[PDB]
Amino acid sequence: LPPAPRYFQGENTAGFMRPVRFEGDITNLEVVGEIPKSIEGTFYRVMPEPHLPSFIPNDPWFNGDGNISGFYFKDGHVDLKQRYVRTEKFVREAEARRSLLGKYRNRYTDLVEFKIRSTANTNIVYWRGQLLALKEDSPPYAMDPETLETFGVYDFDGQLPSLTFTAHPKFDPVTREMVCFGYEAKGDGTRDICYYSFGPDGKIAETVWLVSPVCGMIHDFAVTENFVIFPIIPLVCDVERMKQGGDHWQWDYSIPMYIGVLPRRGAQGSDVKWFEAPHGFAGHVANAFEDDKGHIQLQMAYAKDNVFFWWPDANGKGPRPGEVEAHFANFVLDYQSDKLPLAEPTYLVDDDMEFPRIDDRVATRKHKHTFFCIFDRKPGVTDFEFVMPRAGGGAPMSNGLAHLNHETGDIQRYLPGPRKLTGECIFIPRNSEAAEGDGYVMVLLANYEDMCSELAVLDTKDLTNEVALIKLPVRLRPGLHGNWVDKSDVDGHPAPL
> 210 vs 76, 184, 192, 214, CA distance in Å?
48, 11, 6, 12
Distance CA 370, CA 382 (A): 23
C-beta closer to a copy of itself: residue 19 or 41: 19
- Among positions 21, 176, 304, 413, the unique one binding a copy of itself when judged by CB under 8 A: 21
107: DSSP letter: G
Distance CA 59, CA 361 (A): 38
Nearest approach, Cβ of residue 127 and ligand PIT (Å):
18
Decide if 278 contacts 248 (C-beta within 8 A): no
* 420 annotated ligand-binding residue: no
Nearest approach, Cβ of residue 83 and a copy of itself (Å):
8
Give the alpha-carbon dihedral of 80, 83, 84, 86, to 10 degrees. -150
Continuous H helices in 75-148: 88-96
Decide if 198 contacts 156 (C-beta within 8 A): yes
Nearest to 353 by CA among 392, 287, 288, 397: 397
How many CA atoms, within 13 angstroms, populate the side-chain half-sphere of residue 313? 11
Query: Which of the choices ligand PIT, a copy of itself, none does residue 475 contact, using the CB cut-off of 5 to 8 A by kind?
Result: a copy of itself
Stretch that binds a copy of itself, among 27-35, 283-291, 356-364, 382-390 (CB under 8 A): 27-35
Q: Binding of a copy of itself at residue 10 (CB under 8 A)?
A: no
Beta bridge partners of 72: 42, 79
Site of interaction with ligand PIT (CB under 6 A): 11-12, 58, 61-62, 86-88, 91-92, 95, 116, 121-122, 135-136, 152-153, 219, 283-284, 301, 307, 321-322, 354, 393-396, 480
Distance CA 433, CA 373 (A): 27
- Among positions 1, 11, 77, 245, the unique one binding a copy of itself when judged by CB under 8 A: 77
Query: Which of the choices ligand PIT, a copy of itself, none does residue 420 contact, using the CB cut-off of 5 to 8 A by kind?
Result: none
* 354 annotated ligand-binding residue: yes
Q: Binding of a copy of itself at residue 390 (CB under 8 A)?
A: no
Binding-residue pattern over the window 407 to 446 for a copy of itself, x denoting contact by CB under 8 A: ----------------------------------------
Strand runs labelled E in 352-408 = 353-357, 369-374, 400-405
434: DSSP letter: P
Query: Which of the choices a copy of itself, ligand PIT, none does residue 94 contact, using the CB cut-off of 5 to 8 A by kind?
Result: a copy of itself
Distance CA 460, CA 42 (A): 19
Backbone dihedral angles phi then psi of residue 173, each to the nearest 5 degrees: -70, -20
Q: Binding of a copy of itself at residue 24 (CB under 8 A)?
A: yes
- Type of residue at 213: P
> Residue 490: CB partners within 8 Å, gap ≥ 6?
none
Nearest approach, Cβ of residue 71 and a copy of itself (Å):
15
C-beta closer to a copy of itself: residue 99 or 212: 99
Query: Which of the choices ligand PIT, a copy of itself, none does residue 253 contact, using the CB cut-off of 5 to 8 A by kind?
Result: none
- The residues in 43-62 that bind a copy of itself, with binding defined as CB under 8 A, are 51-53
Nearest approach, Cβ of residue 30 and ligand PIT (Å):
20
Task: Tell me if residue 180 falls in helix, strand or coil.
Answer: strand
C-beta closer to a copy of itself: residue 8 or 253: 8
Instruction: Please classify residue 189 by burial: count the beta carbons closer than 10 Å to its beta carbon, then call 0-12 exposed, 13-18 middle and 19+ buried.
Output: middle
Binding site for a copy of itself (CB under 8 A): 6-8, 18-28, 30-32, 51-53, 77, 82, 94, 97, 451, 471, 473-475
Binding-site entries for Fe cation: 168, 219, 284, 481
Binding-site entries: 104, 135, 168, 219, 284, 354, 481
Binding-site entries for trans-resveratrol: 104, 135, 354
